[PDB]
Paper text:
Titin is a protein expressed in the skeletal and cardiac, or striated, muscle of vertebrates that plays various roles in muscle structure and function. Encoded by the gene TTN, titin spans half a sarcomere (the basic contractile unit of muscle) and has various functions including preventing sarcomere over-extension (Gautel and Djinović-Carugo, 2016), acting as a molecular ruler for thick filament formation and as a hub for numerous signalling molecules (Kruger and Linke, 2011, Linke and Hamdani, 2014). Fn3 domains are only found in the A-band region of titin, where they are arranged with Ig domains in a pattern termed super-repeats, which themselves are repeated. Fn3 domains have a characteristic beta sandwich fold, with a core of hydrophobic residues as the “filling” between two beta sheets that pack against each other face-to-face.
Fn3-3 and Fn3-11 are found in the non-repetitive region of A-band titin near the tip of the thick filament, Fn3-20 is in the second D-zone super-repeat and Fn3-49, Fn3-56, Fn3-85 and Fn3-90 are located in the 1st, 2nd, 6th and 7th C-zone super-repeats, respectively. Fn3-20 is at position 6 of the D-zone super-repeat, and Fn3-49, Fn3-56, Fn3-85 and Fn3-90 are at the 11th, 10th, 6th and 2nd position of the C-zone super-repeat, respectively. The variant in Fn3-20, Leu18237Pro, was identified in a patient also carrying two C-terminal truncating variants inherited in trans, whilst Val22232Glu in Fn3-49 was co-inherited in trans with a truncating variant in the kinase domain at the A-band / M−band junction. Conversely, Fn3-49 Val22232Glu and Fn3-90 Gly27849Val were insolubly expressed in bacteria and following attempts to refold the protein after purification from the insoluble fraction, were shown to be unfolded by 1D NMR. The crystal structures of the WT Fn3-20, Fn3-49 and Fn3-90 domains help rationalize these observations. Mutation to glutamic acid would introduce a charged sidechain into the core of the domain, which likely renders correct folding of the domain impossible. We see no evidence for dimerization in the crystal structures of the C-zone Fn3 domains determined here (Fn3-49, Fn3-56, Fn3-85 and Fn3-90), agreeing with these findings, and our crystal structures of Fn3 domains in the D-zone and at the end of the thick filament suggest the same organisation of titin Fn3 domains will also be found here.
Author numbering: 2 to 104
The structure:
């Protein structure tokens, strides 16, 4: 008997550019009894209700991802799913709203 994994641990922004935001997280506390196969990153405009998927899970084995194609001076929010062969974790929201900016 196997379940979807738990939420990714400690998600954060760790870099930005004027057109991208880079997120990092840690492996979930539990994997539901089947190995983690990937992660799924979703991004929305902070002033929006429409989340957009940024990648295919099997394409994202590492616990970091650069979200590209973002508009400078526009605020975004992010959430990350852990995935295994059973399904998707509860998403782990990335705290706060974030601008893509040259820092």
């Amino acid at each position: 008997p196997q379940y979807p994994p738990g939420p990714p641990a400690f998600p954060k922004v760790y870099d930005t550019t004027r057109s991208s935001v880079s997120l990092s997280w840690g492996k979930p506390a539990y994997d539901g009894g089947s190995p983690i196969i990937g992660y799924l990153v979703e991004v929305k405009r902070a002033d929006s209700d429409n989340w957009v998927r940024c990648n295919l899970p099997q394409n994202l084995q590492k616990t970091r991802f650069e979200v590209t194609g973002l508009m400078e001076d526009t605020q975004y929010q992010f959430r990350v799913y852990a995935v295994n062969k059973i399904g998707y974790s509860d998403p782990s929201d990335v705290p706060d709203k974030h601008y893509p900016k040259d820092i």
